[PDB]
Design a protein around this ligand. Structure first.
Ligand SMILES: O=C(Nc1nc(=O)cc[nH]1)c1nccs1
Ligand SMILES: [Cl-]
Ligand SMILES: [Cl-]
Length: 163
């Protein structure tokens, strides 16, 4: 584990992360997808061999020795707010189990269900709070990746408020 486990946020492409493993914001079918998923497919295509997994679950596939944890958040265009909220929390709990099993000291993670699966709603606080509920009990350094300047500021404020 990390000596003083922390949370940090960076505004850049998660395919350029400086962590020991990456979480992909995957689709259930293991397809190349869009946004973060397409960036992950271009950088670690080998990790999409048998990566299909249901909504609310995570499945890790190695690219060489580098772990890619495919986490499938719900698409809020298809799910109700109550059911989608439950599956989003579940996907993050499965990421925490995989990060612990892998024994890594750091992990790069995007905010699940905040892009094309958001159903057109701002889900920064919802998704980040489920990330903290799952990852708080792990001892890996967590680095959250985002692309929007206003989101970077809001995620950074949420991390600093708890310290
Ligand atoms: O690209 C994104 N998510 C996503 N992409 C897919 O193709 C299928 C499911 N989820 C994200 N970008 C930023 C935060 S999540
Ligand atoms: Cl970049
Ligand atoms: Cl973003």
């Amino acid at each position: 584990g990390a000596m003083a486990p922390s949370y940090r946020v960076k505004r850049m492409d998660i395919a350029k992360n400086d962590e020991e493993c990456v979480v992909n914001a995957a689709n259930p079918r293991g397809l190349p997808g869009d946004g973060v998923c397409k960036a992950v497919y271009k950088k670690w295509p080998e990790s999409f061999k048998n990566s299909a997994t249901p909504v609310g679950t995570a499945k890790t596939v190695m690219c060489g020795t580098y772990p890619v944890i495919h986490a499938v958040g719900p698409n809020f265009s298809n799910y109700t707010e109550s059911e989608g909220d439950r599956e989003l929390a579940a996907a993050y709990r499965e990421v925490a189990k995989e990060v612990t099993r892998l024994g890594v000291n750091s992990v790069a993670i995007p905010l699940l269900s905040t892009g094309v699966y958001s159903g057109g709603k701002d889900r920064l606080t919802q998704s980040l709070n489920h990330l903290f509920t799952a990852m708080d009990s792990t001892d890996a350094d967590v680095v959250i990746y985002c692309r929007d300047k206003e989101w970077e500021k809001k995620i950074s404020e949420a991390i600093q408020m708890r310290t």
